[model samples]
Target: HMSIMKVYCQICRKGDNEELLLLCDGCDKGCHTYCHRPKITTIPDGDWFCPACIAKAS
Candidate 1:
């Protein structure tokens, strides 16, 4: 089983801000809070999903 994977901003495709990057519960992808549309300044308390996954669910 792959326990580790390269986490980066799905929008910008960068690996900066290791702590600020928010992991998506839907696609297991990563995105920066600042890079996100409407810009997420704070981390969510509950489960988080990326835009691509959110679109698919809709």
Candidate 2:
């Protein structure tokens, strides 16, 4: 498990409001919850997945 830190959205490739981003467990990348395709807010209870990782898995 990882704690909070300044991170940018891997997809957006922008790093301003780092607090708004979440770290993906599958790919170990950061992404804004809204930056994600489905647009999520809070970090999910388990196994957060980045868009690319999600696509690769499915």
Candidate 3:
């Protein structure tokens, strides 16, 4: 059987913690604002990078 990957945060691999989640414009991965390095409260205007994708090439 093939295991399916959820659309939750690629970092914590969970999304049930918060109601609002942000998708990485860089890698298209799901992540919560609190789960990121620099806790994000409001949505950014431009492109945003996740911690995982920010380190070198993913």
Candidate 4:
């Protein structure tokens, strides 16, 4: 199913907890701001997501 909810990074397949950013509307994984590829508008501000992942998930 699809999700727009903000989830945790620890549950991700990679389980990255070093730095967590806004949860991607796509993969249900927490995205690191710097980790994001192309970048997108943020809610509170200053958040991003990887292009390829976002494409498949979102």
Please, what are the lDDT tens digits per residue for candidate 4 over residues 15-45? Answer: 4544445665545456554445544244434
Relative to the true structure, how large is the alpha-carbon lDDT of every model? 0.87, 0.75, 0.72, 0.50
Q: What residue runs in model 2 are displaced by over 4 Å at the alpha carbon? A: 1-6, 11-20
Distance (Å) between predicted and true CA of 45, model 2?
1.5
Ranking by TM-score: 1, 2, 3, 4
* Winner on lDDT (3 vs 4): 3
Residues 1-58, model 1: lDDT tens digits: 6697788788899998877789999988998999988999878878888888989999
Candidate 3, poorest ten consecutive residues by summed lDDT: 15-24
Write one digit per residue (lDDT tens) for candidate 3, span 1-58.
8998557876687768545577777787888877767777977666777666779665
lDDT of 2 at 4: 80
Ranked by lDDT from best down, the candidates are: 1, 2, 3, 4
Candidate 2 collision pairs: none
Best by lDDT: 1
How many residue pairs of model 4 clash at the backbone?
A: 0
Displacement of residue 58 (Cα, Å) in model 2 is 2.1
